[PDB]
Structure 1
Amino acid sequence: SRIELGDVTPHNIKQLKRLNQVIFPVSYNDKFYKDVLEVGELAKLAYFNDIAVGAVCCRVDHSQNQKRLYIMTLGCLAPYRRLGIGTKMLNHVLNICEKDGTFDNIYLHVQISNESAIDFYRKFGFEIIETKKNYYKRIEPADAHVLQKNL
């Protein structure tokens, strides 16, 4: 099948909102979707035979005297998993960081129960650097690991 990426645009943001609502256990607010339209290539949809089935949303973060890439959401609808879509999305954002060369690291939060996501990221060089107690407020478990890949 045809598996490729595309932009998040004002015309298709409704599809992104639906994908995130289906995939993730927490809701994202209007501000999140406003911000995704301002990050350029750091937010993308993933398509499988012309239907959007996944997405990645990141932002540049200036914290702890570093320039960091923060991955906020990265996911695929369950029927399309294990087809390389996650890999394509994550390699797209790693390619951007590589071209640039000015990022110190890439990081994200992940619920401690999500073993499969942790192992997926560990394949790309991410490591658990910290565990944030009560990061999530409405889901169980509430703890989040911080995964980081040093660039």
Structure 2
Amino acid sequence: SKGSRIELGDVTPHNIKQLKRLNQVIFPVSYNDKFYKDVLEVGELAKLAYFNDIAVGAVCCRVDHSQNQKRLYIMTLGCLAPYRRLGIGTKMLNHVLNICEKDGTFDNIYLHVQISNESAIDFYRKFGFEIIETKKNYYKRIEPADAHVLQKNL
């Protein structure tokens, strides 16, 4: 961290419009107004990422109680294409993993990744996520429609 050009910051009503703007560019699906209202209620489970003080990415997660487990679902985690491979993803993912580790009550953390997304698959597998399922027809309008479920056991 010493001398890093990357910092995470809180999401607030002042910068929620910035988060939406980033999400629009980065992710191929659009999120509704309820999504953005919810982000304001999850505390440290949502953050904006800054590179040299410029907002370039974001992470939004929620707690999911399914399969009789307590799970952390990564709804969105990403940064703008020109700033990729600079460790921003790592900073965001490590933040969420540290929240789970300090809580200690999570069974697993998981997300969906479109099957064509090789760089996301490489990235999550680096952190010990495993492809546990491939969901056919996960997306309704984009191609390929299929998504891998990537899960890390905690």
What SS does structure 2 have at the residue aligned with 1:103? Answer: coil
Q: Percent identity?
A: 100
How many corresponding residue pairs?
151
**What do residues 74-93 of structure 1 show as CA deviations (whole Å, max 9, x unaligned)?**
00101111100000000000
Does residue 1:109 correspond to 2:112, yes or no?
yes
CA distance in 2, matches of 1:48, 1:126: 26
CA distance in 1, matches of 2:107, 2:29: 28
What are structure 1's unaligned runs of at least 5 residues? Answer: none
**What do residues 4-59 of structure 1 show as CA deviations (whole Å, max 9, x unaligned)?**
10011111000000000011111111111111111110000000111110000000
Report the TM-score when normalising by structure 1: 0.98
CA distance in 1, matches of 2:121, 2:24: 21
Counterpart for residue 31 of structure 2:
28
CA distance in 1, matches of 2:124, 2:41: 25
What SS does structure 2 have at the residue aligned with 1:110? Answer: strand
The within-5 A match list for 1:38-117 is: 38-117=41-120
Tell which deviates more after alignment, 1-10 or 44-53.
1-10
CA distance in 1, matches of 2:74, 2:128: 14
CA distance in 2, matches of 1:73, 1:35: 13
What SS does structure 2 have at the residue aligned with 1:17? Answer: helix
**What do residues 119-145 of structure 1 show as CA deviations (whole Å, max 9, x unaligned)?**
100000000001111110010000011
Report the TM-score when normalising by structure 2: 0.96
Counterpart for residue 149 of structure 2:
146
